[PDB]
């Protein structure tokens, strides 16, 4: 009889995992402060990693890798890409980004202006975007908007030529879910989702950000065509695969999946020696939400990586059962995989 605890009541993903574990009759849930647990579904912030792996006779497993915030924090990811040789500053699938600190606080302000002035002089598109974990073609507006805030921000090249779906002439992003187990096998969930925009993309008006941001909460609040083309502005790999064939005469595997699989591998392999729980006194596993952009040349770009992602309402059952199968049951065995293993060198 295995035991586990729950320290994040807001987690929709692991609210179902705990539900499934109990349904097995072989797992028992304890109070959130009881330390005799085989598994911990821990809190997002300030998770006490230092207290794990020190219970005699108990193999302990946690659902967060210590150090993955380097990959999921906007300002942390930019720093990991430019400074890591495996990725290099010349990484071809990540938009040219810069870490800007508000003037009320290194910082890449001058390095950003240099690249910004270079574009303005070459008649090239120069529409950037500022964001933070907490759109404009003018450098003054972007830098002034950051000074009006008080946290770290990032200015990265806004993709001015995004692949637009028809009918609609609309933008979108792709969410892929990757599960990394204790042995550090990289499993890609065969099921992805496209969080699309229900408004015709407009390159002459970045002021109205409803046709530029594909977030599920912004579309269901400020967009007037929510749910017109697909339910909940969410299209799945089967329909998107069929549209690619009819319109572009290609496939999702060849056109986009191959690049996504490469991006996933490249990022997780880069920080493997830094978060691997191979020779550690406890074991880790984490589910990642990767967000991609696809331009009009069928090139896949990396947006960000979410360390505590939610899932599409239709995929909660299949994905969660797979977490238990390959992530939890693989360490605590009970009495065709929905994942695509991304083989690599450890």
């Amino acid at each position: 009889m295995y035991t586990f605890v729950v320290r994040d009541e807001n987690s929709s993903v692991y609210a179902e995992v705990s539900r499934l574990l109990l349904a097995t009759g072989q797992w028992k849930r304890l109070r959130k402060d009881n330390p005799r647990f085989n598994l911990m579904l821990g809190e997002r912030n300030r998770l006490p990693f230092g207290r794990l792996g020190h219970e005699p006779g108990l193999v302990q497993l946690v659902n967060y890798y210590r150090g993955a915030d380097k990959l999921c924090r906007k300002a942390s990811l930019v720093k990991l890409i430019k400074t890591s040789p495996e990725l290099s500053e010349s990484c071809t699938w990540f938009p040219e980004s810069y870490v800007i600190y508000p003037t009320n606080l290194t910082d890449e302000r001058e390095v950003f202006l240099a690249a910004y002035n270079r574009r303005r002089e070459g008649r090239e598109g120069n529409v950037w975007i500022a964001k933070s974990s907490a759109i404009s073609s003018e450098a003054s507006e972007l830098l002034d908007f950051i000074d009006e805030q008080g946290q770290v921000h990032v200015i990265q090249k806004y993709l001015e030529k995004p692949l637009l779906l028809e009918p609609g002439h609309r933008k979108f992003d792709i969410r892929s879910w990757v599960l990394v187990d204790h042995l550090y096998n990289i499993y890609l969930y065969r099921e992805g989702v496209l969080r699309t925009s229900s408004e015709p993309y407009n390159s002459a008006n970045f002021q109205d950000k409803t046709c530029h941001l594909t977030n599920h909460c912004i579309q269901k609040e400020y967009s007037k065509n929510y749910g017109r083309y697909e339910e909940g502005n969410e299209m799945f790999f089967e329909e998107f695969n069929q549209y690619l064939m009819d319109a572009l005469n290609t496939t999702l595997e060849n056109s986009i999946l191959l690049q996504i699989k490469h991006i996933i591998r490249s990022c997780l392999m880069c920080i493997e020696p830094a978060i691997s729980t191979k020779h550690l006194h406890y074991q880790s596993f984490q589910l990642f939400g990767f967000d991609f952009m696809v331009d009009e040349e069928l090139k896949v770009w990396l947006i960000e990586v979410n360390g505590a992602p939610a899932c599409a309402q239709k995929l909660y059952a299949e994905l969660c059962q797979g977490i238990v199968d390959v992530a939890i049951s693989s360490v605590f065995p009970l009495a065709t995989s929905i994942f695509i293993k991304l083989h690599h060198h450890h």
């Binding site: 990693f49 207290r51 020190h54 150090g67």
Partner: protein
């Protein structure tokens, strides 16, 4: 030549000291009766080993050590053991009833009565030193005498020996080998009153030594013998530079490893630990044993140095080790490991090579190796050990459990929260220096 006095306090300190001085004799070729054929200067000399042994007119080499325990059962073993002839009676001090795992009982109730006697015995050794450097205090965090009397002895040492350095070898309490439930209280009580008085303290988590014994030595249920025989290896390698001609003085330990005073808790790493019962093993290269210094499985305290920041790193090599191979492995490891130094400190390594390889106790558990390295590193990841304890402390103190046993000995309940507020600050100090 400058002398060093060792002070063993409590059950843990005495037994560990017994295992250390055993190794010291085998290393310096001193027989159980105290004779040393290799020493040609009879009755005197200022050699590298004289920092730890004194010489009599009869040629007996006597350790500069003192054993203290409020109970006579542990020190009686030394009085009749193989090495009984090494020490004289004045060096072994014992009471008649221990501190019952109660810090207050050792610090206030019993300590008061035996404190002036211990200091006087120490003064007798000090009266034999031509240039005393400091003291090496072995004790346990959980023991009532080890935690309670040590803290009092330290306070009095900083008074009677102001300018002398003091180093601790502290045993971090582990549940797998301890039957005591209050050791968190004692640990936090002793690290509080002892902080301002210790200049550098090496913690040994019994949890670490235990798994090192089961994993590397294939001992299903290890004993204190098995645990001490190992610890003395790590202690020997850390003290080897004081007894042999290699680099030298106790002042170097703080200067080299402790930039900020409160953060005087280095992390030790030792390799290779090979089982003598093994038929034969591939003699690990300098690169391999040096690469082992960054596996947590070889650390005296279990923690992740990849998620802290370093402040210093020494590599104490013993055996067949040459500088060319050390730098080769180092460059190899830098391009593979996660080693983050603080910005106010350089990113480098002090290295000392001693050509005589590590000595092993005959019939012991440790196999003879051709080259061994002990790394001393001041990581902020050792703050995990304080977090672990401070949590347990908080769990019980919230219900005031076991507090009456302490107050029953004259200690005030405020000394608990006072000691805890000090550990909360010590945890903050580490996070300030190590996190961004």
């Amino acid at each position: 030549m400058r002398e060093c006095i060792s002070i063993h306090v409590g059950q843990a300190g005495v037994q560990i000291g017994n295992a250390c001085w055993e190794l010291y004799c085998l290393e310096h070729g001193i027989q159980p009766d105290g004779q040393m054929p290799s020493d040609k200067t009879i009755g005197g000399g200022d050699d590298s080993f004289n920092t730890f042994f004194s010489e009599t007119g009869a040629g007996k080499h006597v350790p500069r050590a003192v054993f203290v325990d409020l109970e006579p059962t542990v020190i009686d073993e030394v009085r009749t053991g193989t090495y009984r002839q090494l020490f004289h009676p004045e060096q072994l001090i014992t009471g008649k009833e221990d501190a019952a795992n109660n810090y207050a009982r050792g610090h206030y109730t019993i300590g008061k009565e035996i404190i002036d006697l211990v200091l006087d015995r120490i003064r007798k050794l000090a009266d034999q030193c031509t240039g005393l450097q400091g003291f090496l205090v072995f004790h346990s965090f959980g023991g009532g005498t080890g935690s309670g009397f040590t803290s009092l002895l330290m306070e009095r040492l900083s008074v009677d020996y102001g300018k002398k350095s003091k180093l601790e070898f502290s045993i971090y309490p582990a549940p797998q080998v301890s039957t005591a439930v209050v050791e968190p209280y004692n640990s936090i009580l002793t690290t509080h009153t002892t902080l301002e008085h210790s200049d550098c303290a090496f913690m040994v988590d019994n949890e670490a030594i235990y798994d090192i014994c089961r994993r590397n030595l294939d001992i299903e249920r290890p004993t204190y013998t098995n645990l001490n025989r190992l610890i003395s290896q790590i202690v020997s390698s850390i003290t080897a530079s004081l007894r042999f001609d290699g680099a030298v003085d106790l002042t170097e330990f703080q200067t080299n490893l402790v930039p900020y005073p409160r953060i005087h808790f280095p992390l030790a790493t030792y390799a290779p630990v090979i089982s003598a019962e093994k038929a034969y093993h591939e003699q690990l290269s300098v690169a391999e044993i040096t690469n082992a210094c960054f596996e947590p499985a070889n650390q005296m305290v279990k923690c992740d140095p990849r998620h802290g920041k370093y402040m210093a790193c020494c590599l104490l090599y013993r055996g067949d080790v040459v500088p060319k191979d050390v730098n080769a492995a180092i460059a190899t490891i830098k391009t593979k490991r996660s080693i983050q130094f603080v910005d106010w400190c350089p990113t480098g390594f002090k290295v000392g090579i001693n050509y005589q390889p590590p000595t092993v106790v005959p019939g012991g558990d440790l196999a003879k190796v051709q080259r061994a390295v002990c790394m001393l590193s001041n990581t902020t990841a050792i703050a995990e050990a304080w977090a672990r304890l401070d949590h347990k402390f908080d769990l019980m103190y919230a219900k005031r459990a076991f507090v009456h046993w302490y107050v029953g000995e004259g200690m005030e309940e405020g000394e608990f929260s006072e000691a805890r507020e000090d550990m909360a600050a010590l945890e903050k100090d580490y996070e300030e220096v190590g996190v961004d």
